[PDB]
Amino acid sequence: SAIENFDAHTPMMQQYLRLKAQHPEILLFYRMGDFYELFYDDAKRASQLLDISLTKRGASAGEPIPMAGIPYHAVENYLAKLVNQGESVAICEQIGDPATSKGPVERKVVRIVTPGTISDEALLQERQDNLLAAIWQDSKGFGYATLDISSGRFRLSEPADRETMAAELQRTNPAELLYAEDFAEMSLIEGRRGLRRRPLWEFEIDTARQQLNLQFGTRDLVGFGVENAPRGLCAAGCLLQYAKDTQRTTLPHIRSITMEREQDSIIMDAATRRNLEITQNLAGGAENTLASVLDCTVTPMGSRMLKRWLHMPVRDTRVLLERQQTIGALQDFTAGLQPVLRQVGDLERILARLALRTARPRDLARMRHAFQQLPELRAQLETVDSAPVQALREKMGEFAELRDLLERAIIDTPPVLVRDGGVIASGYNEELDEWRALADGATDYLERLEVRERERTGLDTLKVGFNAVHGYYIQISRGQSHLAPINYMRRQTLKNAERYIIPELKEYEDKVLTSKGKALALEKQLYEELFDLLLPHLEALQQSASALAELDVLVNLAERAYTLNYTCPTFIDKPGIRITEGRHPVVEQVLNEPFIANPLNLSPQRRMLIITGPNMGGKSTYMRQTALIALMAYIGSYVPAQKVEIGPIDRIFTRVGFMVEMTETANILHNATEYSLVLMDEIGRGTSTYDGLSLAWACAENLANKIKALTLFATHYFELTQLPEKMEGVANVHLDALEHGDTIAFMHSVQDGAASKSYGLAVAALAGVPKEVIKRARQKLRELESIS
Amino acid sequence: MQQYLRLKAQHPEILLFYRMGDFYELFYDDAKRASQLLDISLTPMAGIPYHAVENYLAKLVNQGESVAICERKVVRIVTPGTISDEALLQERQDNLLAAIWQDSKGFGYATLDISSGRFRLSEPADRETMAAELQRTNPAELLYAEDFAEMSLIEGRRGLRRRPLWEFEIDTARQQLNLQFGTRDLVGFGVENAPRGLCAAGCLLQYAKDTQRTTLPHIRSITMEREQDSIIMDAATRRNLEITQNLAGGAENTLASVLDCTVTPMGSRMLKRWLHMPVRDTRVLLERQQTIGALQDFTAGLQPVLRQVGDLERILARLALRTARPRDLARMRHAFQQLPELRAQLETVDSAPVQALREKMGEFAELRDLLERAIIDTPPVLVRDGGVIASGYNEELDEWRALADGATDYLERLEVRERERTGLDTLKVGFNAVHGYYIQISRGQSHLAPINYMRRQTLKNAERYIIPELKEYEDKVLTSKGKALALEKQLYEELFDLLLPHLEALQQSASALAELDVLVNLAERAYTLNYTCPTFIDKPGIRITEGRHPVVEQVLNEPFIANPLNLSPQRRMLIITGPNMGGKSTYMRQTALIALMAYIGSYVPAQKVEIGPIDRIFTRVGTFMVEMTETANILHNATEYSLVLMDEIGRGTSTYDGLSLAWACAENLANKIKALTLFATHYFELTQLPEKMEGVANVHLDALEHGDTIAFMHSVQDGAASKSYGLAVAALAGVPKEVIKRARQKLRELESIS
DNA sequence: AGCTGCCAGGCACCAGTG
DNA sequence: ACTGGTGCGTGGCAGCT
Ligand SMILES: Nc1ncnc2c1ncn2[C@@H]1O[C@H](COP(=O)(O)OP(=O)(O)O)[C@@H](O)[C@H]1O
Ligand SMILES: [Mg+2]
């Protein structure tokens, strides 16, 4: 096993190892001329993941070196295979110039691709956020922080406990999570994609204040509302140190951070988010969710924004009224605005690629195209009487200048890259038209020299061509070549031709090639100059992008209210919900039969409904529809009902039924307040008959009598219908069933009162439990009903 | 590409891989389907590299999709149930074609394994045993009749194939099948009066033959599977016992994972088949028993030799289809070289079955010797390029190779001659398709090329040339090589000629080797893991002393606690109270698996097991609705020979209704049915059942409060449970002191009256 | 239209002339 | 020390069919 000290290595392997040791945990692509290459175990892994050959590399002393690699022009394809598997790559490039370089040319890692810091169009999902998060734990709480690199959205929060932290990880769903080496509660995080253990020094607070002030160009973070917040700042510090280290360029689009407080949003727990199928259904897919229904936005950025609001309802009455207003003002204007807004596309990600300086030609094209829709959007929106719509008309901006620049700079449909030129347009730079001018002897000159030399020699097989390896030539067939001028110089031989070079062609080769390299460089100077001219207006460009996404959202929720018959919610001071004719938004589109609308009435005097009714009677659904109506109302949307009054809701809790059920329930009892909506679905599990019910009863009583929260409480325990009798705030409601003949009818109708009876025997009969057994069950029931 | 849609008329219901360069390209609506099933992208194009077609065909084919290749006209069709290439199968898993069919009377069913020739039919009467047969056999491809009524059974299955009604005609069926097997009638196969099943098998065989476009000389038999030959296990039971597959779709923490230490892939597949089809006939069981005990001693000697034998079943398939590539032959040779050693080790085992497996096994010495002399030690994957046939097998071939080598030797020396005659140290001789051989000088030295050298190609740093002498010897090499390659192929096709007449005996060998793999494994497993030989009794009853869950005991690193079990007709039902937390559930399932293992012929995880005849095994251990429907199936279909295992029915409905259904169920199962039953319940009110009816007793699990925890004991005790622990766990989970207090009052109040 | 085989641009290696 | 040949991934495409 070779001892491999520094001197045992070649100049190349020495250099490769310094850089490898900057990032020992992750794959390193190492630029060698036209190939990106990997070595040692990296090569063996790449070989297994990227389906390429594992080969070797000769060595004057000792062991051979395992090696794999791909040509430079295929990189993006392979990076996609790797980031789709949760893998990071450090990309190493050549900085220097081999000709002014005795040893190996100089080499830096210029970039690291990681699942959380990708900004390229090919490696992302259009309609779905891809966040980088940092997390860390204290002796009292959590610090958490998300950055979305391809928009600059930088956020900070300090969840108070395990279950709020869990709910946050579920909500943000980071593609990559940096977490501190001493994180205690690993069960929040174990089994998460993109997990990245970090050293504790990256979470040091004085360094975080330093990075973030530096970054934001401030002295303190008071203006951002986070000087207050050292737990969170330490995740933000780690997160930004990383973003920086993966990008290794400045990041002008990350110009701010905001704190997400408990009190600004309704905080749904983890069960709640799952039970309501907000963007992922219970089997993991995106069919039959809230979002499948509501989301008909016409730009990717507008669909992501919608999904964030759905997930994070604001509590701010002002903001909510504003959004509701906008939705009603724009009812009519949707069919005109939507086709036009669709042509804005994903402006937000393009400006991100603009700030990272990675934007390609078609990115500037689509940006130019976006600016071209701004006038038509301005004209439509002028007529809409709504101060909120006008603020969003105003934030949208116009950018006449920058539009006119991209029309005079890029051609109508440029190629995918700038590497191959043919991107910058005519008239933009008069030195460039002049450099193409000279490299337009390709048309005229060559055909003329050809026909001239064909006529002159009388050699009819004579052609003129170009070949990358040997340059220009004059071909002559093998059978005519013994007849060519003595002047003609052998350049390249072939099985049945002989190609030649004379001084007039080689002169024309020296000027085509060199004028073409001069013209390409210039084009790249000019194309990177588009960034210098576009970038100073970046602030307003991001505000334009966000304006347009918000518009896309509100216009969408305006169309959805109209189409699916939703009305405006009103807000009240105290806790309570009053629905007239509410429907479950999702279930009312999938069902082929018609949806039975039911009411609800929660107040402080009527703050807990014990809900009976048969299995399949519609109990769960009535509970979910309450939470979704409350949810849509607190994103500012119209709501699926004839009428809705609703008061302030701080937090929604769900428990849907061993230890986990009890623990979940403890948390409901410790953190629920009079402002929470609590959904308990068929809880209280014991080991003997009355064990678990005793527990639900005690729990219910705590919710009614001590916590006084708003509680929908579905049960099959008929014994809990005796709760109202005994408890202030508690009422019985029930889902009507109908036992005509021998079968059962599920009315999905909510009535007031306890049910006339439970229906368990009936459901069993339905499932084909033999008649003879149902007969005896009915006998014992009658026995049990005589105790009381 | 207007000659694409024309070809998708030819075969429309099949994905159409279309040659486009170094790629196969799917277009309109095959491409939609293809980018969703394989994670690759679309533009309506889709694409895959040529180097990975078998790698992308194996995915599509194990999601129930046929694929048609195109190179132009459709040159190849692979279907899921008909593949036999080793790159396209999973090494340790059966892959079946199946046909299904219905009658006024009932169902017909057939299954083929195209690689082993294992052909089987059956005639399930009710639909639930038809469902049962579909989960067990789990075809990769399902042929069903057009005007088939009960689509509910086969609706969600992958690999469905709608078929004309005439493909199920009984007279076509009998006549095909008899033609396939060389018989006038099917009486020697035991299926002549099995028309429902025959129709299914007549379709199946038709399809097989059509997909192959060959003889299938290896399918020479069919067998009826009968209801009474087997312990019937519904899908739900099969799934809850985690036999091959775990409740969470994986292959671990399963019975087959603990017990499957077979050494050959064909022996692993056979074991899994026994594990899903326990037999009622104790004769076959006493025999497997007797064999495992006979071999406990010879196991260490046998398994490394058998491991070497590999997959002789699937190689023989490829021998019968005539597709067996040189390594398939090289590894059949290796298998043969183990038979004499295998025969020596088994010589002394004093059981008549091991000696029958030893005769059946065979030796085939002169076939061993034929391939020792025919093929080289490590031949290439394909015959295509030769270097497979051995030095000294055939006179002509060595002659043609010696002429090639002497032409190729000349040319290595032509290089040293030209280079010593010119003084040009960069001169060499190479070969490619464009030029044949050529002298190559480098660019810097090429201006001193002899004037007799004719230039044919200029590279960037070299020039290449030909001379007459170079082209003359190119002729000698290429004609020789070509003749020796044509001959290699002819010689290799002649191995198929000489091997195939013994195909029957070879299949009997692979089969016998498979069983031996299984029994040698079941025997190592019994010994290693302290199992015991179960005795069988006449009337029903299970009696276990210190028995264990075979899987939980290897997986969980905690002390497994063993438990007794006494069921007879005077003690048919145990009401099981106390905590569950899987303790009850492990206890119940372990009864099922000990019974299951008894009835494949294996040893079992206990110190003693006596067990009576069992016709079915029901295990409702796992909505309220599904629980009632599974329970309803138990009550409609259980007999006094069934083992029934119920987990706490009544949960998820009112106390009284669910107590009422529990009670009534247990009555039924104990009085009417009289099945052997473990009825786990939470209802303490059911513990008054032994007092009211004969045959019922009370067992329970207890638990132990200590330090700052609870200890759920794993131990079954007589009598009803004295305690509940819902509240105890509640306390330990953080539920406020005072909520717990209130709950404790209410509990006393509710139980109080009872 | 297909199939085979040069080439890319780094670096190190290696066998032959100081 | 130089000099001039060698080898090393995958993919693009010239140069033959
Ligand atoms: N109000 C309604 N109108 C029409 N169908 C309904 C309604 N409520 C429920 N359903 C139907 O009944 C089914 C059962 O709903 P669920 O709330 O789960 O019943 P439960 O929870 O009482 O067992 C749902 O899948 C839905 O299709
Ligand atoms: Mg429910």
Give the CATH fold of the A265-383+537-565 domain: MutS, DNA mismatch repair protein; Chain A, domain 3 (1.10.1420)
How far, in Å, is the centroid of ligand 2 from the Cα of A613? 10
Chain A closest-CA separation from residue B333 CA (Å): 31
Report phi then psi at A536, rounded to 5.
Answer: -65, -25
**Is the Cα dihedral A282, A286, A288, A292 positive or negative?**
positive
- How distant is the alpha carbon of residue A219 from its chain centre? 32
Q: Under a CB-based contact definition with an 8 Å cutoff, are residues B506 and B116 in contact? A: no
A132 CB neighbours strand D below 7 A: no
CB count, 10 Å around CB of B251?
Answer: 13
Q: Under a CB-based contact definition with an 8 Å cutoff, are residues A77 and A40 in contact? A: no
Question: Under DSSP, is residue B102 helix (H, G, I), strand (E, B) or coil?
Answer: strand
Question: Under DSSP, is residue A280 helix (H, G, I), strand (E, B) or coil?
Answer: coil
Chain B closest-CA separation from residue A668 CA (Å): 10
Report phi then psi at B459, rounded to 5.
Answer: -90, 180
Q: How many CA atoms lie within 13 A of A509 on its CB side?
A: 17
Interchain contact B631–A (C-beta under 8 A): yes
Q: Could you tell me the maximum CA-CA distance found in chain A, to the nearest angstrom?
A: 124
* Integer Cα distance of A292 and A277 in angstroms: 10
Which residues of chain B does A718 touch, with a Cβ-Cβ cutoff of 8 Å? Answer: 654-656
Give the CATH fold of the B94-229 domain: Nucleotidyltransferase; domain 5 (3.30.420)
Q: Under a CB-based contact definition with an 8 Å cutoff, are residues A177 and A133 in contact? A: yes
How far, in Å, is the centroid of ligand 2 from the Cα of A615? 7
Question: Under DSSP, is residue A717 helix (H, G, I), strand (E, B) or coil?
Answer: coil
- How distant is the alpha carbon of residue A143 from its chain centre? 21
- Homologous superfamily assigned to B1-88: DNA repair protein MutS, domain I (3.40.1170.10)
Class of domain B230-348+502-530: mainly alpha
* Integer Cα distance of B590 and B586 in angstroms: 6
Structure tokens at A763: 């459901």
Establish whether B578 is an annotated binding residue.
yes
The enclosing H or E element of B752 equals helix B737-752
Interchain contact A97–B (C-beta under 8 A): no
* Integer Cα distance of A724 and A730 in angstroms: 5
* Integer Cα distance of B230 and B615 in angstroms: 7
Which of A540, A126, A548 has the alpha carbon at shortest distance from A337?
A548
DSSP label at residue A357: T
Q: Under a CB-based contact definition with an 8 Å cutoff, are residues A232 and A159 in contact? A: no
Which residues of chain B does A665 touch, with a Cβ-Cβ cutoff of 8 Å? Answer: 733, 735
Which residues surround ligand 1 with Cβ inside 6 Å?
A 587, 591, 595-596, 613, 615-621, 748
Q: Are strands B428-432 and B535-536 parallel, antiparallel or unpaired?
A: unpaired
Which residues of chain B does A760 touch, with a Cβ-Cβ cutoff of 8 Å? Answer: 624, 653-654, 657-658, 660-661
Residues A321-351 as b/e (b if ≥16 CB within 10 A, e otherwise) read: ebbbbbbebbeebbebbbebbeebbbbbbbb
Q: How many residues comprise chain B?
A: 754
* Integer Cα distance of A343 and A460 in angstroms: 55
Class of domain A566-788: alpha beta
Task: Reply yes or no on domain A1-123 having CATH 3.40.1170.10.
Answer: yes
Q: Under a CB-based contact definition with an 8 Å cutoff, are residues A191 and A221 in contact? A: no
Residue A405 vs residues B603, B620, B650: alpha-carbon distances, Å: 84, 73, 75
Q: Could you tell me the maximum CA-CA distance found in chain B, to the nearest angstrom?
A: 120
* Integer Cα distance of A646 and A570 in angstroms: 7
Chosen from A124, A499, A662, A694 to mutate, greatest number of chain B CBs within 10 A: A694
Chain A closest-CA separation from residue B249 CA (Å): 14
As separate numbers, helices (DSSP H) first and strands (DSSP E) second, chain A gives 27, 26
DSSP per-residue string spanning B122-156: E--SSHHHHHHHHHHH--SEEEEETT-S-GGGTSS
Place of tokens 């029958």: B356
* Integer Cα distance of B575 and A689 in angstroms: 14
E strands, B2-57, in order: 15-19, 23-25, 47-49
Q: Under a CB-based contact definition with an 8 Å cutoff, are residues A131 and A116 in contact? A: yes
Q: Under a CB-based contact definition with an 8 Å cutoff, are residues A545 and A351 in contact? A: yes
Structure tokens at A35: 């190939």
Report phi then psi at B303, rounded to 5.
Answer: -65, -35
Q: Under a CB-based contact definition with an 8 Å cutoff, are residues B504 and B217 in contact? A: no
Give the CATH fold of the A129-264 domain: Nucleotidyltransferase; domain 5 (3.30.420)
Q: Is B118 exposed, middle or buried (0-12, 13-18, 19+ CB in 10 A)?
A: buried
Which amino acid, A340? V
What's the per-residue H, E or C state across B450-512? CCCCEEEEECCCEEEEECHHHHHHHHHHHHHHHHHHHHHHHHHHHHHHHHHHHHHHHHHHHHH
Q: How is the beta sheet containing A677-681 ordered, strand by strand?
A: A267-268, A651-656, A677-681, A710-714, A608-612, A730-738, A745-752
Q: Is B259 exposed, middle or buried (0-12, 13-18, 19+ CB in 10 A)?
A: buried
A52 CB neighbours strand D below 7 A: yes
Rg (CA), chain B: 34
Question: Which residue out of A616, A680, A713 has the highest number of ligand 1 atoms within 8 Å of its CB and is therefore the one to mutate?
Answer: A616
- Which residues lie below 8 Å from residue B307, measured CB to CB, with a gap of 6+? B263, B264
Q: Which residue lies with its CA nearest to atom 12 of ligand 1?
A: A618
Q: Is A168 exposed, middle or buried (0-12, 13-18, 19+ CB in 10 A)?
A: buried
Which of B627, B595, B623 has the alpha carbon at shortest distance from B609?
B595
Q: What is the resolution of this structure in A?
A: 2.5
Structure tokens at B335: 């298998």
Which amino acid, A95? I
| Fold match, B230-348+502-530 / B364-499 | yes
DSSP per-residue string spanning B366-377: HHHHHHHHHB-S
Q: How was this structure determined?
A: X-ray
Report phi then psi at A488, rounded to 5.
Answer: -75, 135
Q: How is the beta sheet containing B462-466 ordered, strand by strand?
A: B428-432, B436-442, B462-466, B454-458
* Integer Cα distance of B427 and B662 in angstroms: 94
Question: Under DSSP, is residue A83 helix (H, G, I), strand (E, B) or coil?
Answer: helix
* Integer Cα distance of A681 and A274 in angstroms: 14
Q: Under a CB-based contact definition with an 8 Å cutoff, are residues A229 and A156 in contact? A: yes
Give the number of beta-carbon pairs within 8 Å between A and B.
210
Which of B76, B35, B75 has the alpha carbon at shortest distance from B59?
B35
E strands, A668-741, in order: 677-681, 710-714, 730-738
Residue B580 vs residues A687, B54, B558, B584, B712: alpha-carbon distances, Å: 7, 49, 18, 5, 9
Question: Under DSSP, is residue B332 helix (H, G, I), strand (E, B) or coil?
Answer: helix
Residue of chain A nearest B729, judged by CA positions: A659
Query: Could you tell me which residues are beta bridge partners of residue A608?
Result: A711, A730
Question: Under DSSP, is residue B107 helix (H, G, I), strand (E, B) or coil?
Answer: strand
- How distant is the alpha carbon of residue A774 from its chain centre? 54
A69 CB neighbours strand D below 7 A: yes
Interchain contact B632–A (C-beta under 8 A): yes
Q: How is the beta sheet containing A497-501 ordered, strand by strand?
A: A463-467, A471-477, A497-501, A489-494
* Integer Cα distance of B388 and A738 in angstroms: 79
The reply to whether residue B635 touches residue A760, judged by beta carbons under 8 angstroms, is: no
> Torsion-angle region of residue B18: left (phi > 0), alpha (psi -120 to 50) or beta?
beta
Q: Closest protein residue to C1 using CA and C1' atoms?
A: B21
* Integer Cα distance of B298 and B348 in angstroms: 10
CA A415, C1' C5: Å apart?
30
DSSP label at residue B184: S
Please state which architecture CATH assigns to domain A399-534: Orthogonal Bundle (1.10)
Place of tokens 């969980």: B556
Question: Under DSSP, is residue A483 helix (H, G, I), strand (E, B) or coil?
Answer: coil
Q: Which of B657, B685, B739 sits opposite A702 (nearest CB)?
A: B739
CATH number of the domain at B364-499, out of 3.40.50.300, 2.40.30.10, 2.60.120.200, 1.10.1420.10? Answer: 1.10.1420.10
Q: Under a CB-based contact definition with an 8 Å cutoff, are residues A711 and A687 in contact? A: no
What's the per-residue H, E or C state across B204-273? HHHHHHHHHCCCCCCCCCCEECCHHHECECCHHHHHHCCCCCCCCCCCCCCHHHHHCCCCCHHHHHHHHH
Which amino acid, A706? K
CATH number of the domain at B531-754, out of 1.20.120.850, 3.40.605.10, 1.10.10.10, 3.40.50.300? Answer: 3.40.50.300
Q: Is A743 exposed, middle or buried (0-12, 13-18, 19+ CB in 10 A)?
A: exposed
Q: How is the beta sheet containing B608-611 ordered, strand by strand?
A: B535-536, B608-611, B542-547, B563-567
- Which residues lie below 8 Å from residue A686, measured CB to CB, with a gap of 6+? A692, A693, A694, A695, B682, B724, B725, B726, B727
Which amino acid, B491? L
DSSP label at residue A707: I
Q: Using the atom order of ligand 1, give the atom closest to the CA of residue A681.
A: 21
Which bases of chain D are contacted by protein, using any atom under 7 A from a CB?
4-12, 14-17
Interchain contact B652–A (C-beta under 8 A): yes
DSSP label at residue B580: -
Residues A768-787 as b/e (b if ≥16 CB within 10 A, e otherwise) read: ebbeebbebbbebbeebeee
Q: How many CA atoms lie within 13 A of A95 on its CB side?
A: 6
Place of tokens 């305690």: B723
Q: Using the atom order of ligand 1, give the atom closest to the CA of residue A624.
A: 17
* Integer Cα distance of A770 and B631 in angstroms: 10
Place of tokens 């001193």: B448
* Integer Cα distance of A321 and A636 in angstroms: 7
What's the per-residue H, E or C state across B673-717? HCCEEEEECCCHHHHHHHHHCCCEEEEEECCEEECCEEECCCCEE
* Integer Cα distance of A47 and A37 in angstroms: 11
Q: Under a CB-based contact definition with an 8 Å cutoff, are residues B576 and B701 in contact? A: yes
* Integer Cα distance of A250 and A255 in angstroms: 11
Q: Is A282 exposed, middle or buried (0-12, 13-18, 19+ CB in 10 A)?
A: exposed
Residue ranges per structural domain of chain A: 1-123, 129-264, 265-383+537-565, 399-534, 566-788
Q: How many residues comprise chain A?
A: 788
Question: Which residue out of A611, A748, A766 has the highest number of ligand 1 atoms within 8 Å of its CB and is therefore the one to mutate?
Answer: A748
Query: Could you tell me which residues are beta bridge partners of residue A153?
Result: A148
Which amino acid, A685? R
Query: Could you tell me which residues are beta bridge partners of residue A144?
Result: A135, A157
Chain A closest-CA separation from residue B186 CA (Å): 41
Which amino acid, A589? Q
* Integer Cα distance of A523 and A503 in angstroms: 30
* Integer Cα distance of A365 and A367 in angstroms: 5
* Integer Cα distance of B606 and B530 in angstroms: 8
DSSP label at residue B534: P
> Mutual orientation of helices B352-361 and B326-346 as an angle, nearest 10°?
150
Q: Is B671 exposed, middle or buried (0-12, 13-18, 19+ CB in 10 A)?
A: middle
Q: Which of A616, A768, A781 sits opposite B629 (nearest CB)?
A: A768
Which amino acid, A208? A
Rg (CA), chain A: 35
Helix then strand then coil, in percent of chain B rounded to 5, is: 45, 15, 35
Q: Which ligand is nearest to the CA of A622?
A: 1
Q: Under a CB-based contact definition with an 8 Å cutoff, are residues A733 and A752 in contact? A: yes
Residues B320-355 as b/e (b if ≥16 CB within 10 A, e otherwise) read: bbeebbbbbbbbbbebbebbeebeebbeebebebbe
Residue A531 vs residues A354, A409, A535, B729: alpha-carbon distances, Å: 7, 12, 6, 64
Structure tokens at A74: 């295929």
How far, in Å, is the centroid of ligand 1 from the Cα of A289? 16
- Which residues lie below 8 Å from residue B9, measured CB to CB, with a gap of 6+? none
* Integer Cα distance of A700 and A683 in angstroms: 10
DSSP per-residue string spanning B414-461: HHHHHHHHHT-TT-EEEEETTTEEEEEEETTTGGG--TTPEEEEE-SS
Residues A12-23 as b/e (b if ≥16 CB within 10 A, e otherwise) read: bbebbeeebeeb
Q: Which of B625, B653, B733 sits opposite A758 (nearest CB)?
A: B653
Structure tokens at A254: 């990350």
Which amino acid, A555? V
Q: Is B390 exposed, middle or buried (0-12, 13-18, 19+ CB in 10 A)?
A: middle
Q: What angle do CA A611, A616, A617 make, to 5 degrees?
A: 45
Q: Under a CB-based contact definition with an 8 Å cutoff, are residues A525 and A300 in contact? A: no
Structure tokens at B728: 């105890």
CA B424, C1' C18: Å apart?
20
Residue A290 vs residues A275, A588, A654, A679: alpha-carbon distances, Å: 11, 11, 17, 18
DSSP per-residue string spanning A291-339: HHHH---SSHHHHHHHHHHHHS-B--HHHHHHHHHHHHHSTTTHHHHHH
> Mutual orientation of helices B468-499 and B395-422 as an angle, nearest 10°?
160
Q: Under a CB-based contact definition with an 8 Å cutoff, are residues A323 and A644 in contact? A: no
